[PDB]
C-alpha cells in the first residue's frame, strides 16, 4: 500500500509514516535531481469533477546532509522557519541544502543564498535558474554594506559557518537587515573553531558572545549522533 504523510510540529516540515520514516518537504519545482534523490508523489483522494485531486509532491530530506533536519529530529518546539517568511541563508557551499529551504519556506518565501566562493556559485546559479524563489549573491559575507542594494530585508537569519569570528559576522548582518524580535538560528561546529580542547568551554564562550550581541538563546542543545560534536543554537534578537 501507500504511506501517509502528516505534518510535524512545524508547518512546512512533514513526516512520512510508517514503514518509511522520512523527513519530507513540499516540492514545488519537480523533475529535479539535486543528488539523484527520489521523489514522493502523494495526494488526498476526493470525488470531484474535472481533474483528479492533486498529487502535491514531497521530497525527502536527510539529517545526514543538513543540520536543520537533524535539529528537527533531535527535538524542538519553536522555530522561525515557516511557510511565507524571509530567510538569510549564510553560506551554502554547494547549493544542495538551499532547495530544501526553498521547499519548506513556501512559494511566498524568498531564500537568499550567501556565497563568497567562485566554484560552488556555478551550482547556486544552476539552482537559481530552476526555482523561482532563490536569489544567489556572490558577495563578501563580512561586509553588509557591499550587498545592501541587492537584498531587501529578511525575517530570520541562518548561520551555517563555523568560523572563530562569526560573532562579528552575523552581528553586522543582524544590525543591518534583521527586524526586532527576529530569529537567529546558528549551527556552530565545535572542532571547526579549535581542536585542542573540550567543547563545553567553546559553547560557553560562544553563548557568552551571544549574550554580548543581544541574542537570547531560548534553547541550545547538542543535536544527537546524526552529527558528531556539533550544536545548533536558537536565539531571538532584541527579545
Amino acid at each position: 500500500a501507500k504511506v501517509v504523510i502528516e505534518p510535524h510540529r512545524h508547518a512546512g516540515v512533514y513526516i512520512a509514516r510508517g514503514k518509511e520514516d522520512l523527513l519530507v518537504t513540499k516540492n514545488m519545482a519537480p523533475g529535479e535531481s539535486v543528488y539523484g534523490e527520489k521523489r514522493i508523489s502523494v495526494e488526498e483522494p476526493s470525488k470531484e469533477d474535472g481533474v483528479p485531486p492533486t498529487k502535491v509532491e514531497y521530497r525527502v530530506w536527510n539529517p545526514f546532509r543538513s543540520k536543520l533536519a537533524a535539529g528537527i529530529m533531535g527535538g524542538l518546539d519553536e522555530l522561525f522557519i515557516a511557510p511565507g517568511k524571509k530567510v538569510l541563508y549564510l553560506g551554502a557551499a554547494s547549493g544542495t541544502s538551499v532547495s530544501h529551504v526553498s521547499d519548506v519556506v513556501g512559494p511566498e518565501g524568498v531564500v537568499y543564498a550567501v556565497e563568497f566562493s567562485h566554484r560552488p556559485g556555478r551550482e547556486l546559479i544552476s539552482m537559481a535558474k530552476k526555482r523561482p524563489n532563490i536569489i544567489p549573491i556572490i558577495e563578501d559575507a563580512r561586509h553588509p554594506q557591499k550587498y545592501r542594494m541587492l537584498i531587501g530585508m529578511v525575517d530570520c537569519v541562518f548561520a551555517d559557518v563555523a568560523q572563530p569570528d562569526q560573532a562579528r559576522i552575523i552581528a553586522l548582518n543582524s544590525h543591518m537587515f534583521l527586524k526586532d524580535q527576529g530569529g537567529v538560528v546558528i549551527s556552530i561546529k565545535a572542532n571547526c573553531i579549535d581542536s585542542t580542547v573540550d567543547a563545553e568551554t567553546v559553547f560557553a564562550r560562544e553563548v557568552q558572545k551571544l549574550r554580548e550581541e543581544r541574542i537570547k538563546p531560548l534553547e541550545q542543545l547538542t543535536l544527537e549522533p546524526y552529527e558528531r560534536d556539533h550544536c545548533i543554537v536558537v536565539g531571538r534578537y532584541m527579545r
Binding site: 572542532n191 571547526c192 579549535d194 581542536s195
Partner: protein, 122 residues
Amino acid sequence: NPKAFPLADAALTQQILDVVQQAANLRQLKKGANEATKTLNRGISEFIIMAADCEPIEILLHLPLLCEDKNVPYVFVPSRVALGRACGVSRPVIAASITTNDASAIKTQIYAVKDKIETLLI
C-alpha cells in the same frame, strides 16, 4: 602557485618524506595520481601527498575535492623530485597515497602526522 594550499614548511616536509619513505619500505604505498585516485574511490587511503610544483597543475586539482568529499586529509609538498625519490622510483612522482592497516608497525607515526594535517586543514 597560489592554488598550492595548504603548503608546508621545512620540518613537517622532512617528517612527511620520512614517513613516506618508511611506508615505501613496507610495500604499503600507492604511486601515481591515477592509482591514488583509485584508492580514493575505493576508500582505502589514509591520506594523499601531492607535489605542489606540478606543472601544469590542471592534472591534480580534483583530488582535494574528492578528499573533502570523503573527509580524507591532504598536504601539498613543494617539490616532486624529493617525493618520487622518497618513494624508491628514479622518476618524478606528483601524487601518492598511503593505505590503511590495523596491524602495520608504523601506525603511530601515521596517526601523529594525520593529526598534524587535521591541524593544517582547520
